[PDB]
Design a protein around this ligand. Structure first.
Ligand SMILES: *[C@@H]1O[C@H](CO)[C@@H](O[C@@H]2O[C@H](CO)[C@@H](O[C@@H]3O[C@H](CO)[C@@H](O)[C@H](O[C@H]4O[C@H](CO)[C@@H](O)[C@H](O)[C@@H]4O[C@@H]4O[C@H](CO)[C@@H](O)[C@H](O)[C@H]4NC(C)=O)[C@@H]3O)[C@H](O)[C@H]2NC(C)=O)[C@H](O)[C@H]1NC(C)=O
Ligand SMILES: *[C@@H]1O[C@H](CO[C@@H]2O[C@@H](C)[C@@H](O)[C@@H](O)[C@@H]2O)[C@@H](O[C@@H]2O[C@H](CO)[C@@H](O)[C@H](O)[C@H]2NC(C)=O)[C@H](O)[C@H]1NC(C)=O
Lengths: 338, 420
């Protein structure tokens, strides 16, 4: 009965923030949002957010009073990240994501720390994960979209473009209901999720060159579209960066820009197949000078249990491999992006 | 290259008594502030920083930038350029509110905590000292001091107001030089003269208190005085001065610093402005924004500082440039209390405030003065700053804006200490 797919065009900011637009309310109030498979909550800044919070003042605010479809809830909501925490209250309203209108519970955020959100081009987050991950056990937006039964398939897919490879053209694309064969070549290699409730799969090993340096006895791999870099445990990333000859410069891991192009391939062993990134895929080659330091698109994030410890495959991975998230068969499909 | 690009990770973790004292009368004899000794003190702080300390320093650097751009925007909106120049210090403004936070409890603490954008005042103030250390420690391989940054904090209190010692000792974590003095507020114009006289004695800087336009019940002034001296690498004082065009009908002959070499540059054709980076040291530089047409300055400020971002120095690229600009000697001040009170904010430093860790006695804030003494000194595409421009002082090592500036008129004048 349902035969519709929907395409959301994304803006690529510095190969770190891939964001699209959603409407909330009647009439729609538009917000720039990152679509994260690593989380399950929808939240945007609130009009009720104090002007003291710089991060609220320099982003779009949701005014509930200007929405004729707004329904009050007011249940407190706290979303805890690595460094900072955003908090607010739940509200219900009609959200327009793609061309699909859906009644959705989301967070009106009234407290935003300057760090890291003053570096965010996006206003809010759309969680594309499972209700098991949703704080306050709030029904995720993609569950409520499946309930409508309008989608061709209960799947969504991600294309992220390179910022340098293309200039003044498509930053990225989310498809709800299928995958766009214009942005991937060949067929999808599908890998079953370990368990429903997380976009997480088994990883057999992580190879630097031919040798398998890390994840020798097996480990976990969360596919997080909202994560800028590939992340691993502090333990794993310190070993990886030792092997690459990369040094810590303030917050970044860097190598000399001239040594960047000779850095070895990094391979992630997923579903009995090698997913390889060359130095061109995980180094930001701003220069090729022997005096300048170039940043690696890889960092340490110690994700707590029960989801972690785990690797997170972010935009660095997805830029290489077009990714299809299949809720029907609880599996992830990877194919070469073009 | 010089700007931090944050990698986002949106996976949800889901995890008896205080000694007090009446400060010494302001009239009492105090020895001048030793600026050279204060620099040496900061350089040692820098040399003893571990890599975790440098990370915490870089974080408060970024926090200070965000608040600094915001409060610069408030100044620009509410007052604009007051008689030639506006100079604001993101780090000092952040330090002032972090210093008041140390003394604050309950609603006042919560509000200050929110606007700073981050609980432990001691750690924040220590990090902010590290930021200043990381700046002045640069260029100390040679005997010449390319960078000097002196901060003096005046804490002027009415009779019967006892400062708590832990508060005063706490401020030392950020600013070693803290001068608490008892001062009569019954005549506000006489009170302002006495502060300006005392600050002239101990520093030798031209200062102007705003305390005339304060509450008659005022018991506390919390004034921050900053002196920056920056020697630009490969620049000399031209013997002959050149015309600076304030407008189409007005010019002033001023001494010009001239230097030629390889400076990072970018001419933005769409937004219509040129950026130039003149280094002081390895990591610390002077940024110079120049509108392509002199009438667009407000528009250019709108697309740079007012965006509250460093994206306008992202596209910088090396270039062979001959840079001529005025030898700046700017002495000005504004009341932070008054700025915040007239801006689009809830009340922080109102009559109903709680600074009970500062004193148990009645606190009524007369002014929170931020006073800056800014000096640029000496050691093909011609970039000539002979028309109004914006500037900033940026340190890569702490991702820290030390100063934001707008120069409509490069002349020194006492009317930079005028308060609305
Ligand atoms: C994000 O983080 C928040 C905050 O930390 C989490 O919220 C917490 O979630 C906990 C669940 O893991 C909540 O803990 C429960 O609190 C209940 C009281 O309010 C209590 O009833 C529960 O106790 C039972 O379960 C425990 C297992 O975790 C057992 O150890 C315990 O013995 C109890 O077991 C039951 O016992 C009765 C009678 O004795 C039997 O009849 C039942 O059959 C038993 N059941 C089971 C399964 O054994 C438990 O302590 C906690 O309240 C809550 N905290 C707050 C402040 O709300 C979120 O979960 C987390 N979210 C995500 C997505 O990570
Ligand atoms: C705020 O909403 C929650 C969730 O409400 C449910 O889901 C919404 C999307 C909407 O469809 C509602 O009609 C649903 O009821 C409320 O939590 C529920 O509380 C009831 C108790 O009356 C309970 O039966 C449900 O199991 C709860 N659901 C969850 C997920 O906890 C909550 O009561 C609302 N709060 C207010 C103040 O209105």
């Amino acid at each position: 009965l349902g035969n519709t797919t929907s395409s959301v065009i994304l803006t690529n900011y510095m190969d770190t923030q891939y964001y699209g637009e959603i409407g909330i309310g009647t009439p729609p109030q538009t917000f720039k949002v990152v679509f994260d498979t690593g989380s399950s909550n929808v939240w945007v800044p609130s009009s009720k957010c104090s002007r003291l919070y710089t991060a609220c003042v320099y982003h779009k605010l949701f005014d509930a009073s200007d929405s004729s479809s707004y329904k009050h809830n007011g249940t407190e909501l706290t979303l805890r990240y690595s460094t900072g925490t955003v908090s607010g209250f739940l509200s219900q309203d009609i959200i327009t994501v793609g061309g699909i209108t859906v009644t959705q519970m989301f967070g009106e955020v009234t407290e935003m720390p300057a760090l890291p959100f003053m570096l965010a081009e996006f206003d809010g987050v759309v969680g594309m994960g499972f209700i098991e991950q949703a704080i306050g056990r709030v029904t995720p937006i993609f569950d409520n979209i499946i309930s409508q039964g309008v989608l061709k398939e209960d799947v969504f897919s991600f294309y992220y473009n390179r910022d340098s490879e293309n200039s003044q053209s498509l930053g990225g694309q989310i498809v709800l209901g299928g995958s766009d064969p214009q942005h991937y070549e060949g067929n999808f290699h599908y890998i079953n999720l370990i368990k429903t409730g997380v976009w997480q799969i088994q990883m057999k090993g992580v190879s630097v060159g031919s040798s398998t340096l890390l994840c020798e006895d097996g480990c976990l791999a969360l596919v997080a579209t909202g994560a800028s870099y590939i992340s691993g445990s502090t333990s794993s990333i310190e070993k990886l960066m030792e092997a690459l000859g990369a040094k810590k410069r303030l917050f970044d891991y860097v190598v000399k820009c001239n040594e960047g192009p000779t850095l070895p391939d990094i391979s992630f062993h997923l579903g009995g197949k090698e997913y390889t990134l060359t130095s061109a895929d995980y180094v930001f080659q701003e220069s090729y000078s022997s005096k300048k330091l170039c940043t690696l698109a890889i960092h340490a994030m110690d994700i707590p249990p029960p989801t972690g410890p785990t690797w997170a495959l972010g935009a660095t991975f997805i830029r290489k491999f077009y990714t299809e998230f299949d809720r029907r068969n609880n599996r992830i499909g990877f194919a070469l992006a073009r | 290259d010089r700007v931090y690009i944050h990698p986002f990770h949106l996976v949800i973790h889901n995890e008896p008594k205080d000694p007090t004292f009446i400060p010494a009368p302001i009239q009492a004899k105090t020895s001048p502030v030793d600026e050279k000794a204060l620099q040496d003190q900061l350089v040692l702080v820098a040399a003893k920083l571990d890599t975790e300390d440098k990370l915490r320093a870089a974080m408060v650097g970024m926090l200070a930038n965000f608040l600094g751009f915001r409060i610069y925007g408030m100044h620009s909106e509410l007052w604009g350029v007051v008689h030639g120049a506006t100079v604001l210090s993101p780090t000092a403004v952040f330090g002032t509110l972090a210093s008041l936070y140390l003394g604050a409890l309950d609603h006042t603490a919560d509000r200050l905590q929110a606007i700073l954008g981050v609980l432990d005042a001691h750690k924040v103030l220590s990090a902010l000292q590290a930021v200043q250390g990381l700046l002045v420690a640069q260029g100390r391989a040679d005997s010449q001091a390319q960078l000097l940054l002196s901060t003096v904090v005046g804490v002027f209190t009415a009779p019967g107001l006892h400062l708590k010692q832990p508060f005063v000792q706490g401020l030392a974590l950020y600013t070693p030089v803290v001068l608490p003095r008892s001062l009569d507020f019954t005549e506000l114009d006489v009170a302002a003269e006495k502060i300006d006289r005392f600050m002239q004695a101990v520093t030798g800087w031209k200062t102007g208190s705003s305390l005339m336009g304060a509450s008659v019940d005022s018991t506390l002034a919390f004034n921050t005085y900053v002196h920056f001296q920056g020697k630009m690498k490969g620049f000399s004082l031209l013997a002959e001065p050149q015309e600076f065009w304030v407008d189409q009908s007005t010019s002033v002959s001023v001494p010009m610093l001239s230097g030629m070499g390889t400076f990072q540059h970018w001419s933005d054709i769409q937004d219509q402005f040129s950026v130039t980076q003149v280094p002081f040291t390895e990591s610390a530089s002077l940024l110079l924004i120049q509108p392509h047409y002199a009438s667009d300055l407000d528009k250019v400020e709108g697309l740079t500082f007012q965006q509250n971002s460093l994206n306008w120095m992202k596209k910088l690229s090396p270039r062979t440039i001959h840079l001529t600009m005025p030898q700046l000697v700017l002495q000005g001040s504004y009341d932070l209390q008054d700025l915040l009170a007239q801006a689009e904010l809830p009340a922080i430093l109102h009559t109903e405030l709680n600074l009970q860790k500062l004193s148990n006695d009645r606190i009524r804030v007369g002014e929170v003065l931020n006073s800056i003494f800014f000096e640029l000194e000496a050691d093909v595409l011609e970039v000539t700053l002979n028309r109004p421009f914006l500037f900033a002082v940026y340190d890569q090592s702490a991702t820290a804006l030390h100063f934001l500036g707008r120069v409509a008129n490069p002349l020194s004048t006492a009317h930079h200490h005028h308060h609305h």
